Design an enzyme around this catalytic site. Structure first.
Site, PDB file in Angstrom:
ATOM      1  N   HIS D 133       0.804  -1.210   0.000  1.00 10.90           N
ATOM      2  CA  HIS D 133       0.000   0.000   0.000  1.00 10.90           C
ATOM      3  C   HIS D 133       0.841   1.265   0.000  1.00 10.90           C
ATOM      4  O   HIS D 133       0.283   2.358  -0.134  1.00 10.90           O
ATOM      5  CB  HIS D 133      -0.937   0.015   1.209  1.00 10.90           C
ATOM      6  CG  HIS D 133      -2.075  -0.948   1.107  1.00 10.90           C
ATOM      7  ND1 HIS D 133      -3.108  -0.784   0.213  1.00 10.90           N
ATOM      8  CD2 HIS D 133      -2.347  -2.081   1.792  1.00 10.90           C
ATOM      9  CE1 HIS D 133      -3.965  -1.777   0.349  1.00 10.90           C
ATOM     10  NE2 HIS D 133      -3.526  -2.579   1.301  1.00 10.90           N
TER      11      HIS D 133
HETATM   12 ZN   LIG Z   1      -4.637  -6.367   3.218  1.00 12.02          ZN
END
Ligand SMILES: [Zn+2]
EC number: 3.5.1.98
Lengths: 67, 52, 168, 370, 51
Positions: D133
């Site tokens: 992320h």
């Molecule tokens: Zn995740």
């Protein structure tokens, strides 16, 4: 109409079987014994477009190597 | 679900290392009086009748 | 006390309202056509056709009032809540230059369109009011005519760090 | 011993916050279960070499990495503005040894890639990594440095095409944004779309520029199970491996897609989450298995231990051996993670529609004149 | 996998015969393929995807 349709289809059985279920081993023939048909040559185009050739000579029918 | 019964029973089976570490609490000692019919479906049916 | 804004400018103003407020798009602050540049162009174009020296004088002083009021007004009643971050960034970047040399016609027309409500509180002589308002009308016409050169063509998306900075 | 296992004996001692989901303690749990299953002999254990600022600035910006090097939980109050600019401080908290943990994870990943390049190994396992992320200029989703992207860049020095398969319940937003405009890396991510964290991941995000049709997104609804996941995962990966034939695979084995997860909303079991690994291992390509999500430590430990054993080839026992974390495992003490009921929502029509769309996209790479 | 010539020559010829229908319904083909491909179990198992 249903009766006529069913009659025609159920007569074309026993050939639908042969030409649609053994259709996986005739490609194996025209691949192993390399006979040029339209779909073989399209698959070779697919492999060239995967390898991204530019200007060199095409190697051979069985030696483009995304093996 | 007669075969799933045996599958789940095999799934819940004691671990010898846990038994030797003295931390395994069996689950059969919580059930009340379980009926004794021939089929698991019959036992579950008697239980349904008991609830009813 | 009313003005005559062309429909193209009305459409452009509403599109800019939407783009800046809801779609998170801003304008590149250093403009290629300057506010001072456009003011000077319109001034030259009108004086080159004006008639008498009294009119020359009143038009000159009108343009002077316009530029000084822009420079004194921009950062107080001309930006949305999504542009104050950009404004302070531009002030930090160029603390010696001035707004009349920094911003553009995209905000000069906000000034122009908002002038009626300001002259509503102001109550000077009707003669001065009508002169200034006719000048603003001619300016709006000149801008909407020369659209191709004065107005920006595409807006710019604010970066994630900018959006996290403003947050309003 | 073609499996190179990376583990730094410190990784488990870094702490996020008071009640945070991400706990580097799971890596220590996995390693203890391994060393007591005796996989330590069939594996190849390498204590990684720490990354450097020059190694992380390959994918991240210099100011961001300098901030990560300089921050401290005490000077955070003075560094407040740059924090809210760099996303560090709310759900990616600033804790002790942040840079050290990031260096450990990124070093694991880069070392895995270098092993695959040098040829000393064909499978490279790193559980401390997988933070997918992280973005070019801001942290996100408990992630700080994109070790997956650093590893892909190290693989591309020798390999011509690289596949990246995400089976974490969230979108691989960072890696997709990194490789959105290139055809040398294809990013296939299966995720839960809708009202969920990353927000990105529509079936229509397919790349731009040269990387048109090289991002593959498979959105899924709540409560997918083993059979449904198989029916969506095996066709898509086979079609990918057919049309875009990669030379190296990077598999993010994230286990928040399991059943009973603090943040996930799926229903996979140990078998449904491991048939993926098996299908990908079945192509005899060099592969890096990186960790990822997973916020229930018991399930995470047992599933990752099983997957390590499956990659090494050994079929581990069914009873957990004596380890220093035995009580963590429930009233059964078995190596398994059963599924729950949680009525499914993925209809066969939905799955078939999204699969047909993905297949048409992958086919357009070789049909569809240039 | 089959470096030697006659093995793959034989497989070529046998697939050719099955195509040209000069042999029976998959019996002799399966037998001869499983014979000439019997030291390589992976390929022997992969051939079944074409049946
Ligand atoms: Zn995740």
């Amino acid at each position: 109409m249903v009766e006529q349709d069913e009659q025609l289809c159920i007569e074309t059985f026993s050939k639908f079987d042969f030409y649609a279920t053994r259709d996986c081993e005739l490609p194996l023939r025209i691949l192993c014994d390399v006979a040029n048909d339209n779909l073989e040559n399209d698959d070779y185009v697919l492999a060239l477009r995967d390898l991204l050739r530019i200007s060199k000579w095409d190697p051979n029918q069985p030696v483009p190597a995304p093996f | 679900l007669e075969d799933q019964v045996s599958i789940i029973q095999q799934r819940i089976i004691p671990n010898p290392v846990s038994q030797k570490q003295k931390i395994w609490r069996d689950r059969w000692n919580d059930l009340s009086d379980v009926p004794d019919e021939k089929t698991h479906y019959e036992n579950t049916y008697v239980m349904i009748l008991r609830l009813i | 006390h009313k003005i005559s804004v062309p429909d193209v400018l009305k459409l452009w103003l509403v599109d800019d309202w939407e783009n800046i407020t809801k779609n998170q798009q801003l304008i590149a602050i250093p403009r290629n056509p300057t506010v001072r540049a456009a003011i000077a162009a319109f001034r030259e174009s009108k004086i080159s056709h004006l008639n008498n020296e009294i009119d020359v004088d009143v038009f000159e002083q009108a343009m002077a009032g316009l530029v000084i009021y822009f420079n004194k007004c921009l950062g107080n009643m001309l930006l949305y809540r999504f542009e104050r971050q950009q404004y302070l960034e531009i002030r930090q970047q160029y603390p010696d230059t001035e707004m009349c040399d920094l911003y553009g016609v995209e905000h000069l027309i906000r000034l122009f369109v908002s002038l009626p409500e300001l002259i509503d509180r102001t109550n000077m002589d009707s003669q001065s009011i009508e002169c200034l308002l006719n000048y603003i009308e001619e300016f709006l016409k000149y801008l909407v005519l020369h659209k191709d050169e004065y107005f920006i063509k595409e807006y710019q998306n604010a970066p994630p760090n900018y959006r996290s900075l403003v947050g309003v | 011993k073609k499996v190179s296992y990376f583990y730094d004996e410190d990784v488990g001692n870094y702490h996020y916050g008071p009640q945070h989901p991400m706990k580097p303690h799971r890596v220590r749990m996995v390693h203890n279960l391994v060393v007591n299953y005796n996989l330590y002999e069939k594996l190849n254990v390498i204590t990684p070499v720490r990354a450097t600022r020059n190694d992380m600035t390959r994918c991240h910006t210099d100011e961001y990495i300098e901030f990560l090097w300089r921050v401290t939980p005490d000077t955070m109050e003075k560094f407040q503005p740059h924090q809210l600019k760099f996303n560090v401080g709310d759900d990616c908290p600033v804790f002790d040894g942040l840079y050290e943990f990031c260096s450990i994870s990124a070093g694991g990943s880069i070392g895995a890639a270098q092993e695959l390049n040098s040829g000393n190994a064909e499978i490279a396992i790193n559980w401390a990594g997988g933070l997918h992320h992280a973005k070019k200029r801001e942290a996100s989703g408990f992630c700080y440095v994109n070790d997956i992207a650093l590893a892909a860049l190290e693989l591309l020095k020798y390999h011509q095409r690289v596949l990246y398969i995400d089976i974490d319940v969230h979108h691989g937003d960072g890696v997709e944004e990194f490789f959105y405009t290139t055809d040398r890396v294809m990013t296939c991510s299966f995720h839960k779309f809708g009202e969920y964290f990353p927000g990105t991941g529509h079936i229509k995000d397919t790349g731009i520029g040269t990387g048109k049709n090289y991002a593959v997104n498979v959105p899924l609804r709540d409560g997918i199970d083993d059979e449904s996941y198989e029916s969506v995962f095996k066709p898509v990966i086979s079609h990918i491996m057919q049309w875009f034939r990669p030379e190296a695979v990077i598999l993010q084995c994230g286990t928040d897609s399991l059943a009973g997860d603090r943040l996930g909303c799926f229903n996979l079991s140990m078998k449904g989450h491991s048939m993926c690994v098996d299908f990908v291992k079945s192509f005899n390509l060099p592969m890096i298995c990186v960790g990822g999500g997973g916020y229930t430590v018991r399930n995470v430990a047992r599933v990752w231990t099983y997957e390590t054993g499956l990659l090494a080839g050994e079929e581990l026992d069914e009873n957990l051996p004596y380890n220093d974390y035995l009580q963590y495992y429930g009233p059964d003490y078995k190596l398994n993670v059963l599924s729950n009921n949680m009525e499914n929502h993925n209809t066969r029509q939905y799955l078939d529609s999204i699969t047909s769309e993905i297949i048409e996209n992958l086919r357009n790479l070789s049909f569809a004149p240039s | 996998a089959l470096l030697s010539n006659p093995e793959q020559f034989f497989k070529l010829q046998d697939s050719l015969r099955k195509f040209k229908n000069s042999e029976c319904s998959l019996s002799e083909l399966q037998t001869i393929v499983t014979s000439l491909l019997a030291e390589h179990p992976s390929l022997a198992h992969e051939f079944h995807n074409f049946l």
